[PDB]
Amino acid sequence: NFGEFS
Amino acid sequence: NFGEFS
Amino acid sequence: NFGEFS
Amino acid sequence: NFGEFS
Amino acid sequence: NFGEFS
Amino acid sequence: NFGEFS
Amino acid sequence: NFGEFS
Amino acid sequence: NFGEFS
Amino acid sequence: NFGEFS
Amino acid sequence: NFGEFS
């Protein structure tokens, strides 16, 4: 699981 | 599961 | 942007 | 930006 | 930036 | 699990 | 920047 | 697990 | 910059 | 586990 990336 | 990405 | 997840 | 996850 | 995760 | 990256 | 994780 | 990177 | 982790 | 890098 992870929050976010760009 | 993950939050978001762009 | 987001609050939370599980 | 995000709050939290598990 | 993010708050926390586990 | 990880928070974020760019 | 982030607060904490485990 | 890790916090963030760029 | 970040606060802490374990 | 690690905090961050650039």
Curated annotation (Swiss-Prot), chains A, B, C, D, E, F, G, H, I, J:
Summary of the tissues where the protein is detected: Ubiquitously expressed. In particular, expression is high in pancreas, placenta, lung, genital tract and spleen.
PTM statement from Swiss-Prot or TrEMBL: Hyperphosphorylated in hippocampus, neocortex, and spinal cord from individuals affected with ALS and FTLDU. Phosphorylated upon cellular stress.
Subcellular location: Nucleus; Cytoplasm; Cytoplasm, Stress granule; Mitochondrion
Subunit structure: Homodimer. Homooligomer (via its N-terminal domain). Interacts with BRDT. Binds specifically to pyrimidine-rich motifs of TAR DNA and to single stranded TG repeated sequences. Binds to RNA, specifically to UG repeated sequences with a minimum of six contiguous repeats. Interacts with ATXN2; the interaction is RNA-dependent. Interacts with MATR3. Interacts with UBQLN2. Interacts with HNRNPA2B1. Interacts with ZNF106. Interacts with CNOT7/CAF1. Interacts with CRY2.
Note on domains (UniProt): Consists of an N-terminal domain (NTD) and two tandem RNA recognition motifs, RRM1 and RRM2, followed by a C-terminal glycine-rich region. Contains a nuclear localization sequence and is mostly nuclear; however, its nuclear export sequence permits it to transport mRNAs to the cytoplasm and even to synapses as part of neuronal granules.
Disease affiliated with this protein: Amyotrophic lateral sclerosis 10: A neurodegenerative disorder affecting upper motor neurons in the brain and lower motor neurons in the brain stem and spinal cord, resulting in fatal paralysis. Sensory abnormalities are absent. The pathologic hallmarks of the disease include pallor of the corticospinal tract due to loss of motor neurons, presence of ubiquitin-positive inclusions within surviving motor neurons, and deposition of pathologic aggregates. The etiology of amyotrophic lateral sclerosis is likely to be multifactorial, involving both genetic and environmental factors.
Function: RNA-binding protein that is involved in various steps of RNA biogenesis and processing. Preferentially binds, via its two RNA recognition motifs RRM1 and RRM2, to GU-repeats on RNA molecules predominantly localized within long introns and in the 3'UTR of mRNAs. In turn, regulates the splicing of many non-coding and protein-coding RNAs including proteins involved in neuronal survival, as well as mRNAs that encode proteins relevant for neurodegenerative diseases. Plays a role in maintaining mitochondrial homeostasis by regulating the processing of mitochondrial transcripts.
Protein name (record): TAR DNA-binding protein 43
